[PDB]
Amino acid sequence: GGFVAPNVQFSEAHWQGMEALPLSIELKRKLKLPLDLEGLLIDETSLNAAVSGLLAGDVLVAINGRKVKTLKKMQKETRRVQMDRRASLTVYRKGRLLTLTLSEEKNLGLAQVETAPMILPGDIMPHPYRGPCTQCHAIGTTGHITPDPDGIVLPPGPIRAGAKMPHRDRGPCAACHAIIQ
Amino acid sequence: GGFVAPNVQFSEAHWQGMEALPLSIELKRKLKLPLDLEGLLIDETSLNAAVSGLLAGDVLVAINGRKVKTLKKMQKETRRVQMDRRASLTVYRKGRLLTLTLSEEKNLGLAQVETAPMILPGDIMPHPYRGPCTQCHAIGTTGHITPDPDGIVLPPGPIRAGAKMPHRDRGPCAACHAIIQ
Ligand code: HEC
Ligand code: HEC
Ligand code: HEC
Ligand code: HEC
Incomplete structure (x- = not known):
């Protein structure tokens, strides 16, 4: 659970x-x-x-x-x-x-x-040592959204056969999109 | 220089x-x-x-x-x-x-x-397409510190021969530290 030392x-x-x-x-x-x-x-x-x-x-x-x-x-x-x-x-x-x-x-x-930010107990410090982690971080699971939204991959949609392509060329449409035909 | 459309x-x-x-x-x-x-x-x-x-x-x-x-x-x-x-x-x-x-x-x-954040003209969008970049970003060089401090590597110091080692074992001290002897 969520540990917060007296003094974050x-x-x-x-x-x-x-x-x-x-x-x-x-x-x-x-x-x-x-x-x-x-x-x-x-x-x-x-x-x-x-x-x-x-x-x-x-x-x-x-x-x-x-x-x-x-x-x-x-x-x-x-x-x-x-x-x-x-x-x-x-x-x-x-x-x-x-x-x-x-x-x-x-x-x-x-x-x-x-x-x-809040950290997991097993999180890797991405910075030089600065002292005991609980001096600066709460320890727990909840302090921010995980999986990080920034790494959630959205599916490209279904597309109707012959739809105009709004992005640059990326390959055959069916490689990535369900084709509504 | 720093471009900011009317409407960021x-x-x-x-x-x-x-x-x-x-x-x-x-x-x-x-x-x-x-x-x-x-x-x-x-x-x-x-x-x-x-x-x-x-x-x-x-x-x-x-x-x-x-x-x-x-x-x-x-x-x-x-x-x-x-x-x-x-x-x-x-x-x-x-x-x-x-x-x-x-x-x-x-x-x-x-x-x-x-x-x-402000972006360079040649910056790679790290997110899905959301519209014209200048709808949301200033374009320029200055909006934040670069090189990002988070990636600046500090030299370990000189150390006196026989200094106590404050970190875990990392190898021969001289691989990383000037030895004051
Ligand atoms: C073959 C020439 C096609 C055609 C006609 C389209 N695609 Fe794609 N597509 C991909 C991704 C990741 C997206 C999301 C938008 C983004 O941020 O780039 C899309 C989007 C589309 C749309 C709009 C979807 C919507 O409903 O708004 C349309 C009409 C579209 N595409 C058509 C990914 C891919 C691929 C992955 C490598 C490939 C190949 C294609 N698309 C190919 C095509
Ligand atoms: C051989 C056993 C040694 C000894 C005696 C020490 N080191 Fe290192 N050291 C390294 C880095 C990146 C730091 C910065 C602190 C951190 O965030 O980890 C340090 C720090 C030290 C200190 C304190 C420096 C200060 O002035 O406060 C001391 C006394 C110290 N070290 C001694 C990196 C390395 C290495 C890179 C792989 C190697 C090998 C060592 N250290 C080895 C030793
Ligand atoms: C303040 C004196 C800190 C101590 C001691 C520790 N950390 Fe830290 N951490 C701190 C800051 C201000 C930040 C934000 C980025 C920056 O360096 O400015 C961080 C970041 C982390 C992260 C990434 C968190 C995230 O983005 O969600 C982790 C995983 C992290 N810190 C771990 C960590 C550990 C394991 C520590 C002790 C051994 C530790 N931190 C100490 C400030 C401080
Ligand atoms: C809002 C509707 C946006 C449009 C249009 C574009 N970007 Fe964006 N960008 C936006 C946000 C809110 C963020 C922060 C992270 C997040 O996704 O929530 C970003 C981030 C960037 C970054 C990283 C910037 C940094 O960390 O310093 C870059 C390089 C970036 N965006 C580039 C970019 C380009 C090239 C765009 C148009 C083709 C573009 N963005 C559009 C919001 C918006």
């Missing part, structure tokens, strides 16, 4: 199109970032975060001049300003600290946080 | 530990769900969403009895109730509609939404 930590925060992660030593080493830089790695931007000029690989240092060194502290600052439409971001990028403005026409809202 | 749609919403996706025909077929079920597939739960009883594979049908058939409409309802501490969820699971209660001690907050 946050792994990501989602805020206005940005995905923010703790900036570990492992990431600092992987990304050739100063080893004493403190902040949150932005590994993805889209939507209002993309519009602000925020980029994947930026390190988020402060929101409204309040330092954010942990996802908890990021969430706290977003909660403070959640009903505002605009917030300042200080971002470390290739050596310079930039200020960027983040805005949404209704309200910025609370950053929504998540833990690392 | 939402792909996911993050709310209190749940990840919600539009429930497409493709997913309905993959998951053997009724083809006329309307709602949002929950593909991941953790944190307060896990505590409510919400499970990966659940379909979110309503929040506070307001139907949510699209991520926009989900976000709208969460915005309505963002300062509340509790909200009702109606969930389709294996044929039954359940009501679940979602709570956070401070406030539930706005669901934070994202688009599908």
Whole structure:
């Protein structure tokens, strides 16, 4: 069944199109970032975060001049300003600290946080060692859909003999489709 | 450079530990769900969403009895109730509609939404055809960190001759580590 130690930590925060992660030593080493830089790695931007000029690989240092060194502290600052439409971001990028403005026409809202996915007891760690697995992962069967939908293969349909072919050439139609004739 | 058509749609919403996706025909077929079920597939739960009883594979049908058939409409309802501490969820699971209660001690907050990742022009679609790529993806180089950090290999360090071995046996130390001697 589903085991969750007292203390499963946050792994990501989602805020206005940005995905923010703790900036570990492992990431600092992987990304050739100063080893004493403190902040949150932005590994993805889209939507209002993309519009602000925020980029994947930026390190988020402060929101409204309040330092954010942990996802908890990021969430706290977003909660403070959640009903505002605009917030300042200080971002470390290739050596310079930039200020960027983040805005949404209704309200910025609370950053929504998540833990690392639930794992099976016999799951293979896809990353370097980071400590005891239950520090970061629930252990169980249910935390996400399996078989992963991403690997479920759908049958091509039946087709009527002489149907126009909507995809590129793939071979004789009957290799893949029941022919309704 | 970075091309974004007028109309890049939402792909996911993050709310209190749940990840919600539009429930497409493709997913309905993959998951053997009724083809006329309307709602949002929950593909991941953790944190307060896990505590409510919400499970990966659940379909979110309503929040506070307001139907949510699209991520926009989900976000709208969460915005309505963002300062509340509790909200009702109606969930389709294996044929039954359940009501679940979602709570956070401070406030539930706005669901934070994202688009599908930015792609290169020559990227290979990892999914079935779903229409023109620019309906769902920005096209460019920057939307996320590449080389993907997940595939960057870190060198094992130098080690002092006779250091205790913290990992299992992997072979002669010098195969992998500079020996400080
Ligand atoms: C011989 C020339 C044909 C014809 C006339 C068609 N097919 Fe295929 N088909 C395949 C797959 C995986 C799909 C799913 C769509 C996708 O993501 O590519 C399809 C789809 C079709 C359709 C549309 C189905 C629908 O109801 O919308 C039609 C009309 C169609 N095909 C006709 C796979 C294959 C193959 C596997 C190697 C082969 C061979 C073919 N198709 C061949 C043809
Ligand atoms: C011969 C018995 C040895 C000894 C004494 C050690 N190693 Fe390794 N090592 C390897 C990798 C990929 C790591 C990173 C940690 C991880 O995620 O597994 C390590 C780490 C170490 C350390 C700690 C490094 C640090 O500064 O914290 C130490 C003390 C250490 N090793 C000693 C990889 C390899 C190998 C690749 C096949 C081989 C062989 C070894 N290690 C062998 C040994
Ligand atoms: C945090 C300090 C972690 C510890 C300790 C462990 N894992 Fe982990 N894991 C972590 C994160 C943040 C992620 C997401 C991807 C990333 O590296 O950023 C992962 C991922 C996994 C996965 C894949 C899960 C999935 O995609 O569904 C597995 C199977 C996994 N981790 C296993 C694992 C094991 C066996 C561990 C201990 C021996 C372990 N992890 C430790 C964060 C952390
Ligand atoms: C929405 C209706 C989509 C259309 C049309 C296309 N893609 Fe897509 N893509 C979409 C989603 C929601 C996702 C995430 C995973 C999932 O299937 O749920 C994807 C993923 C990709 C990826 C991987 C991106 C990454 O992990 O960084 C690629 C490379 C990708 N899609 C390519 C692609 C191409 C070439 C398309 C048109 C011919 C295309 N996609 C259409 C949603 C949508």
